[PDB]
Design a protein around this ligand. Sequence first.
Ligand SMILES: O=C(O)c1cccc(O)c1
Ligand SMILES: [Cl-]
Ligand SMILES: [Zn+2]
Ligand SMILES: [Zn+2]
Lengths: 313, 313
Amino acid sequence: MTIVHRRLALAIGDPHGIGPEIALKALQQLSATERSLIKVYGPWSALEQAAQICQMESLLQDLIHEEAGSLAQPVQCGEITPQAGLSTVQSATAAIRACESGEVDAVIACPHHETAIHRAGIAFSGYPSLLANVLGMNEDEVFLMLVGAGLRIVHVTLHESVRSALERLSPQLVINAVDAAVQTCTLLGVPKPQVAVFGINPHASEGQLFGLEDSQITVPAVETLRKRGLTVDGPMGADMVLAQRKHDLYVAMLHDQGHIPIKLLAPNGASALSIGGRVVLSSVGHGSAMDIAGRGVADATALLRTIALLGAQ
Amino acid sequence: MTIVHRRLALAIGDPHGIGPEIALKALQQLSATERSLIKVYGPWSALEQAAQICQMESLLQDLIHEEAGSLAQPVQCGEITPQAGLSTVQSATAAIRACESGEVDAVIACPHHETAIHRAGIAFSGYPSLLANVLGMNEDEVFLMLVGAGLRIVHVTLHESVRSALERLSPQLVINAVDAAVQTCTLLGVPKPQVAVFGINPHASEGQLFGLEDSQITVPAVETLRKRGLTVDGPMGADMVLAQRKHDLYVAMLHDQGHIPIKLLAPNGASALSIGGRVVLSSVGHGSAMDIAGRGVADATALLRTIALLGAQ
Ligand SMILES: O=C(O)c1cccc(O)c1
Ligand SMILES: [Cl-]
Ligand SMILES: [Zn+2]
Ligand SMILES: [Zn+2]
């Protein structure tokens, strides 16, 4: 059963966490062919460590690898350290640049630890942010798509107050989100997708009966996107459109509009794709699990699910 | 077998639609005891009509009834007429007032026809509205609870712009919604429920990192509600807490937060309860079906489901 149909970068995330271990356990389960399509970014010491523990030294031989986020000392499984924090960001940066340059077609990031990154003195507010800084983009120009249970929902705004999001919403910002998500849909195996744009207000403002925002923002944006020859319905009330379940891509205006349905239908296994330029980066949907790091009992399922997602045709 | 454990009003809705017929067909299936707990509001001519057609004249004898929304002419099954429109609103008003006065404990409305009501020169924007006008309350002092697929979600704000809702949100408004919903949960058969309060902002503001609103509004409200001895978790991010699926009552801050999950999980078989003062009003989940009125084609299932819901214990 082939699940990898294209070149991917895998940053092994925090080298003290379970990231290295799940990386090896996921790769272990693929064919030789599939494994050569995945290039692994991270400190080799960490991968050697996880090979001892999981007993997969044979696997290291055939791994395609680039040293990134090298360590100045032995690995300390379980420990939160600034060096591990830097390592994380360096690996992800190496991977992201490989995607930028075209060497790979998408990126997967194994789990980070935020405290670790913070103690390294690095500003980190999620992968959308990192992606922007590395690529030289405004954070506003990079979006998060959640994927889970058949649903794909790009969010035009994300981790800010509702008020702050409304102040920022514009025709252009929406257009940008759709363009980013459409490019991303090509990668996910849906070339020319059906798009539904959520209303900002209930019932998509109901004309102008429940606020003016939709006639100023979503409506103009949808008209501009149709004229450029995209199949776009909306704005329509998020509740009503979602329930029809007949679009390949929904476009949410606020974090909660897209996050509520996703976590309800796919409460464990939803993948979080940061999109910006040609670079699509997915986290695994779980933490660094410092408690069990080095103990060799971590599950690669979430990782494998993510590979399957970013690696279909 | 027994589904009616309490006194209820049933307004028969549009007397030209299927409302009268389903009223009779629902009552027909209950026991003598159950039938004496349901008082029917509406024109007697309409009930006589539907008795001829469905062949249930024997049933009219047993019925507890109050004439409301009398007609000036014979019933015209299938026809949209302003008289039928007025009749609808009068029956519902009679029913609501019987609930206000304490003669009954909750109210069910059989289907209306909006065009009919509009042509009578009456403003009708849903049952939340009507309930307010009749009881002498602002529309913001009536809350809407959606019920479907095990979820109960009262909304603190409803049919207004997101910004307008945030402007209006207060500790008191939330407390009010919960008090209304809790009283309503007693009626629904869940005396002492587990309550979850949604955050206004993503991740419930994340302390104050994503806006101040939750520390001003939801957090104080939850503390005040615990002090009065209610089991209340939150505020938590709506996405995360819903997915745990461990509470009898969720409290949404905005229309979409509560409407999205409900429509997704229960595209059919959901109930909309309007709560205000002691009055709990539910519609049946369907239209007046003018094309089949008088034709003996409609089932009472949706009506009976609603009776079962408002008549638990
Ligand atoms: O828009 C709503 O308030 C609503 C409430 C219940 C059912 C429905 O289809 C819509
Ligand atoms: Cl009675
Ligand atoms: Zn989030
Ligand atoms: Zn609505």
